[PDB]
Amino acid sequence: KDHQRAVVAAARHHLKKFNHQLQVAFRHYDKKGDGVIDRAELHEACVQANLHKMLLDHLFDYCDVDQDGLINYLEFANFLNW
Amino acid sequence: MRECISIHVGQAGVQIGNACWELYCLEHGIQPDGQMPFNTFFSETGAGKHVPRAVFVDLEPTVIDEVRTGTYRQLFHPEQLITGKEDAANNYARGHYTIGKEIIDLVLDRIRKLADQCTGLQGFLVFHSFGGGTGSGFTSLLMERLSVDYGKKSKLEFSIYPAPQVSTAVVEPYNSILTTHTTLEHSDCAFMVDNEAIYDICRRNLDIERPTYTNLNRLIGQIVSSITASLRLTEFQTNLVPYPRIHFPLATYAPVISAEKAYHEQLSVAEITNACFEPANQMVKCDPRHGKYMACCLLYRGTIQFVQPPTVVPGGDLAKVQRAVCMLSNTTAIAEAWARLDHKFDLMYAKRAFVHWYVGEGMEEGEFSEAREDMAALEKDYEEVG
Amino acid sequence: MREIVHLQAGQCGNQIGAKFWEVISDEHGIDPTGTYHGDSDLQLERINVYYNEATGGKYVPRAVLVDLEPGTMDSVRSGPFGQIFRPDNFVFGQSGAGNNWAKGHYTEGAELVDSVLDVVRKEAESCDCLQGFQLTHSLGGGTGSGMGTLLISKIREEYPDRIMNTFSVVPSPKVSDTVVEPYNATLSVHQLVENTDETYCIDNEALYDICFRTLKLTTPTYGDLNHLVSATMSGVTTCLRFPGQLNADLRKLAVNMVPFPRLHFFMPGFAPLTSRGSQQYRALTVPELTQQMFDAKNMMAACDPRHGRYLTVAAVFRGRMSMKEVDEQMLNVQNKNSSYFVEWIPNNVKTAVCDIPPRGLKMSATFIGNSTAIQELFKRISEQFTAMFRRKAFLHWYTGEGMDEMEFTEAESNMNDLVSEYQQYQD
Amino acid sequence: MREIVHLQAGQCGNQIGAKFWEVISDEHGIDPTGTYHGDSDLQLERINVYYNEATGGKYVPRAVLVDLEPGTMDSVRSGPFGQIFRPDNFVFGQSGAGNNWAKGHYTEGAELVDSVLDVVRKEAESCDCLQGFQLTHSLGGGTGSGMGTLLISKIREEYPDRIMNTFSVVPSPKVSDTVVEPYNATLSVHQLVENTDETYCIDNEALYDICFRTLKLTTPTYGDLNHLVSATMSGVTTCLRFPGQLNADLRKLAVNMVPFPRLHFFMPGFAPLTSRGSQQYRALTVPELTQQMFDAKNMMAACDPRHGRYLTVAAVFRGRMSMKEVDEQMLNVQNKNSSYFVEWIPNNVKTAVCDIPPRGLKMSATFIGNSTAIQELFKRISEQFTAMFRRKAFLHWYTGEGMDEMEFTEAESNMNDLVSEYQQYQDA
Amino acid sequence: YEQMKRDAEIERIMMEEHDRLLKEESAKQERRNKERAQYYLDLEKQLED
């Protein structure tokens, strides 16, 4: 479990790296698509960045805000960084 | 300014002390949280609280904790209540030599503070019994320490004397002879009562069957309050005792009757004075007709061979009588009670019964013989003053 | 503040002991969860004698359960009131003693005697000022008695100035289960005449005749006999827990009873016992209770008083009850009946009265007798020891791992001298 | 702001030194990405002590990783260290360590150390109030000691005023998963008796019996075995990171707890150590906490304490406790079983408390004690040498680099000189 | 009067527990009867075999 946790951490790290490589545009696109922390939207962002999805859905749930499932919108962009 | 300080030691001491302080807070207007809605036995704080001049001491917590939890908890300062960890096991050995050294210091220090907050000293009231271990040995330790310490200020003791026939403990003559041997000289005077005589007088004067300990300690509290009702005490010490060994008066109370007979019978002074001398109404079961009276004190609240009204207790049995008399007599009748008690001791000490507990705790084999000869000396002293 | 530490020994103790801790606990209002649910305030006052306090306001008993087959601990823990203990205090070996003195005393119990005193130590070390211990067992079997006579005598050599109360379910000869019970009871009084400061003698033959005449039950199991034994330890240390108009402690009751040291075997007995078909008709008072506690069939030892003369008597009473009716009623039994009592003891009877009765009873009491005819329970074991040991019927299974022919006859007269010590005081 | 320089060593101490960081990270809240996460501000007050800051909200450690094989740091990279710290200081080669001391000190210990000490010296020179050294090693293997004494020996030659905080899992009497462990001790006694400051002497054996009797668990692997060592090295440094009602630094714990020039070999223990069931059934407040930690059951050794005394005992505490209660209860244990302690110090023990416990616990402590009971471990390794000495039983890797039949036995005398100069003061 | 009222309440309580004893005894007797019926049933089954 801890190994998969570290994997998700490195994934969000590369996500923030791509964010540096724009941030506002990405946030707006995510909001317009499926959901701020939608697991389907999460897998779309994956495909894009290039992070090749049961584990992907698990990471999306982890980022998704408790109950909210949108990762707190603003905090959702914040984790996209993280 | 005529104060006295009360210490209640042993279980018999604390159950007669509870009935006593019930009677005193009843007698004054003191409702038992200490605040009037008197200062001979009380100290008055500036807030308006009355605290008694009392120290309770026992070596089982289950008899002090009833007082600490029950309806008198807002009366005392809660480190007046001395409490051990293991009881003295009905041993003079344990009350004197082994266990009492964990609490005798706290007992003396609370005596020291309660006897420094006062203005003129008159005496102490130690309430005890002659059966049990901490009723014998810790009382003897406290006795010798306070007679060496405070000097000539009078110590009065109240003793439930072991009965002629019936007793709870098997071991009782051992403890009684051994405690009187070293509580002769230190105390100034002590008074005798007997459970068997109080049972007979509770059977036939007030027409109740099956008495118990609260119905006895109500009577003992009325007697003690009648003794010390002339203050709201050295005269007794220079009146009664001829020689410095005979300091055991007997007591009685004359109008101990129920309401149903008290309604018909009046209580003249003549009736109560002769009812004191009737041997049916004595409270120590000795035969006084074989004795000759050497002294009498007759306190009137409200062949006979010489050599402020009472209060009413709630939930009580003694009827409200306008005048009463407490007799503090001194007889030559106790020469048979001592003979029978020392014979009961002698039968067991012919073949060394129960001796080895006290032998392995503190004393030798001759330390009981010393008490034996010093009680034979007491009965040659009554025969001498015959 | 005058505490105690319970212990067990063998199967016969654990059925009594785990029945004991569902008699004390529901008399203290304590659920098998440990959560206090009680009406009175007096109950939480003296929890510190038998118990200890866990985090959360829970109460744990102060006891250790020890045995040499693990089937007898799983039986206790699966019981209704077995969960309350410490799972670290459950101590047991694996290789069974199997009615072997030479195992439970010499070889097999000596790789559990390291472990059991540490559990004795760290549980009797949190106490502030000890009064003693407890050990509940029988004298028939091997590790219920041979380890039980080591757990006494080792503990005697560390805390020798306390009072180590014990129990003893005595081997009944006419109600017998083991063929070799003389070879274990006679070797058990040797190390127990000198190492306990009091020890009771109950036995299963008289526990049947208390259960076939007074109780008049149809089917007595082993849950209604050990119910009788666990309700006469609660009597003898009620004064240690609860207040009363006149209370006698544990150590008070030791001093008054034993005339000379080797005479500390007692005879228990519980005073109100009625059949369930004849309870309403019987009036409850003290004169109609003293005639049941001096009865020869309401005595839980196989011996009889009338083939002897009494030495001393205790009687702790419980309830709301006057004290004249104790003081002269036990004068009277002493007064009329004068042959059965010794004459160099001028008063032969004690007393003690608590304020709190057993649950569901208006009145109760508990007798403790110290007869002199209890030698007839020691003449009836030794004559079953002059027969088997003369032709050496069974010795080679106990002497194959440690004792000798001399070790039994060293400890046979050490049990036979006690008959004569009763005989010299018999008249 | 005070500091101690780390390094990681061996196959043994690398995993425990990998287990070092995850205990610390939950005390403060450094997520392995690097975000601080903890609402208590007292964590944020001393993030200097083991750590370096990074720009962008991240935080990074202070330790440099060396082992002569790849996969151990590829096993540490499977843990969170490569997720936090810089990927420069992973200093790994593919060459063969061989579990020879003389190939942990002479071939790849010689080459690959200067790609490490140039960063061991770098983190020291970047800050000012440097005070110490850490090095998580073992006494066990050849290559965990041959590089372990190398990173100690030449460094006090130029940093001579430091708090050297080593670690050493000692050779067990019974548990042995390596046939060259009796050789790698006496080599590591030629240098590490003089050039250390504190040592956490553990063995493999005593970490099972705590898990067998007290913990009542039925499987110690090497995974959770380390919390008996990793959680109890974090007890000492909570004076530095966190405040308290008293404070004892590890220069003060060098002063208070080391009495002698050379007696600084330690043996820790953690206080609420119990099984699953017994913790409801046993109270552990301060009146019962001290009775646990001074058992013969929470030791990191198999030696017999009743075949010895106790020279200098300290204990660092952690939590909101009454200092009356700790002073009284230490006085009882000091007086009740008073014949354990030596006659030199009149107040034979030492205490120090703080105001921050670990997580999930109302209270704890962390007992670290310099006994004299460890003296009969030393006779064993003289015996495990003397059987492997009249045979020259494995000396054809060590003779390849070269240590003769006298050069071992003049260091064997040195092991006895760690006993003889200890023996001169053992009795009168 | 107060003591008399307490006496009446306590006596009613004990007769309630006696009624509980009567009901559990009747339950145990019916349990023994159903055990007897079960023994008769499978003995008949064995006879058929």
From Swiss-Prot, chain A:
Binding site for Ca(2+) 1: 30, 34, 41
Binding site for Ca(2+) 2: 64, 66, 68, 75
Subcellular location per the Swiss-Prot or TrEMBL entry: Cytoplasm, Cytoskeleton, Cilium axoneme; Cytoplasm, Cytoskeleton, Flagellum axoneme; Cytoplasm
EF-hand domain span: 21-52, 53-82
Subunit structure: Microtubule inner protein component of sperm flagellar doublet microtubules. Interacts with STIM1 and ORAI1; the interactions take place upon Ca(2+)-store depletion and dissociate through a Ca(2+)-dependent mechanism. Interaction with STIM1 inhibits STIM1 interaction with SARAF.
Function comment: Microtubule inner protein (MIP) part of the dynein-decorated doublet microtubules (DMTs) in cilia axoneme, which is required for motile cilia beating. Cytosolic sensor for calcium, modulates the interaction of STIM1 and ORAI1 upon store depletion and the activation of store-operated Ca(2+) entry (SOCE) and NFAT translocation from cytosol to nucleus.
Official protein name in the record: EF-hand domain-containing family member B
Gene: Efhb
Swiss-Prot record, chain B:
Major subcellular site: cytoplasm
The name this protein goes by in its record: Tubulin alpha-1A chain
Assembly description: Heterodimer of alpha- and beta-tubulin. A typical microtubule is a hollow water-filled tube with an outer diameter of 25 nm and an inner diameter of 15 nM. Alpha-beta heterodimers associate head-to-tail to form protofilaments running lengthwise along the microtubule wall with the beta-tubulin subunit facing the microtubule plus end conferring a structural polarity. Microtubules usually have 13 protofilaments but different protofilament numbers can be found in some organisms and specialized cells.
PTM field: Some glutamate residues at the C-terminus are polyglycylated, resulting in polyglycine chains on the gamma-carboxyl group. Glycylation is mainly limited to tubulin incorporated into axonemes (cilia and flagella) whereas glutamylation is prevalent in neuronal cells, centrioles, axonemes, and the mitotic spindle. Both modifications can coexist on the same protein on adjacent residues, and lowering polyglycylation levels increases polyglutamylation, and reciprocally. Cilia and flagella glycylation is required for their stability and maintenance. Flagella glycylation controls sperm motility.
A Pfam family per the record: Tubulin
Cellular compartment(s): Cytoplasm, Cytoskeleton; Cytoplasm, Cytoskeleton, Flagellum axoneme
Enzyme nomenclature, EC number: 3.6.5.-
Annotated Mg(2+) binding sites: 60
Organism the protein comes from: Mus musculus
Cofactor: Mg(2+)
Post-translational modification 3'-nitrotyrosine, affected residues: 263
Gene that specifies this protein: Tuba1a
Swiss-Prot record, chain D:
Top-level taxon of the source organism: Eukaryota
InterPro entries linked to this entry: Beta-tubulin_BS, Beta_tubulin, Tub_FtsZ_C, Tubulin, Tubulin/FtsZ-like_C, Tubulin/FtsZ_2-layer-sand-dom, Tubulin/FtsZ_GTPase_sf, Tubulin_C
Pfam family, one: Tubulin_C
Alphabetical keyword list: Acetylation, Cell projection, Cilium, Cytoplasm, Cytoskeleton, Flagellum, GTP-binding, Isopeptide bond, Magnesium, Metal-binding, Microtubule, Nucleotide-binding, Phosphoprotein
Single GO MF descriptor: GTPase activity
Positions bound to GTP: 11, 69, 138, 142-144, 204, 226
Annotated positions of the Phosphothreonine modification: 55
One term under GO cellular component: mitotic spindle
Protein's GO biological process: flagellated sperm motility; microtubule-based process
PROSITE patterns, sorted: TUBULIN, TUBULIN_B_AUTOREG
Motif (MREI motif) on chain: 1-4
Signal peptide per UniProt: none
Major localisation: cytoplasm
CDD domains, per the entry: beta_tubulin (cd02187)
Cofactor field: Mg(2+)
Locations listed in the record: Cytoplasm, Cytoskeleton; Cytoplasm, Cytoskeleton, Flagellum axoneme
Residue numbers of Phosphoserine PTMs: 172
Tissues where this protein is expressed: Widely expressed. Expressed in the retina and the cochlea.
Entry's free-text remark on domains: The highly acidic C-terminal region may bind cations such as calcium. The MREI motif is common among all beta-tubulin isoforms and may be critical for tubulin autoregulation.
Protein role: Tubulin is the major constituent of microtubules, a cylinder consisting of laterally associated linear protofilaments composed of alpha- and beta-tubulin heterodimers. Microtubules grow by the addition of GTP-tubulin dimers to the microtubule end, where a stabilizing cap forms. Below the cap, tubulin dimers are in GDP-bound state, owing to GTPase activity of alpha-tubulin.
Family: Belongs to the tubulin family.
Official protein name in the record: Tubulin beta-4B chain
Swiss-Prot record, chain E:
Domain of life: Eukaryota
Subcellular location as annotated: Nucleus; Cytoplasm, Cytoskeleton, Flagellum axoneme; Cytoplasm, Cytoskeleton, Cilium axoneme
Organ and tissue specificity: High expression in testis. Expressed in pachytene spermatocytes and post-meiotic spermatids.
Membrane spanning stretches: none
Description of the deletion phenotype: MNS1-deficient mice display situs inversus and hydrocephalus. They are sterile, exhibit a sharp reduction in sperm production, and remnant spermatozoa are immotile with abnormal short tails.
Phosphotyrosine modifications at: 40
Task of the protein: Microtubule inner protein (MIP) part of the dynein-decorated doublet microtubules (DMTs) in cilia axoneme, which is required for motile cilia beating. May play a role in the control of meiotic division and germ cell differentiation through regulation of pairing and recombination during meiosis. Required for sperm flagella assembly. May play a role in the assembly and function of the outer dynein arm-docking complex (ODA-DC). ODA-DC mediates outer dynein arms (ODA) binding onto the axonemal doublet microtubules.
Protein family per UniProt: Belongs to the MNS1 family.
Complexes and interactors: Able to form oligomers. Microtubule inner protein component of sperm flagellar doublet microtubules. Interacts with ODAD1. Interacts with BBOF1.
The name this protein goes by in its record: Meiosis-specific nuclear structural protein 1
Classification lineage: Eukaryota, Metazoa, Chordata, Craniata, Vertebrata
Originating gene: Mns1
From-to range in the entire protein, with total length: 149 to 197 of 491
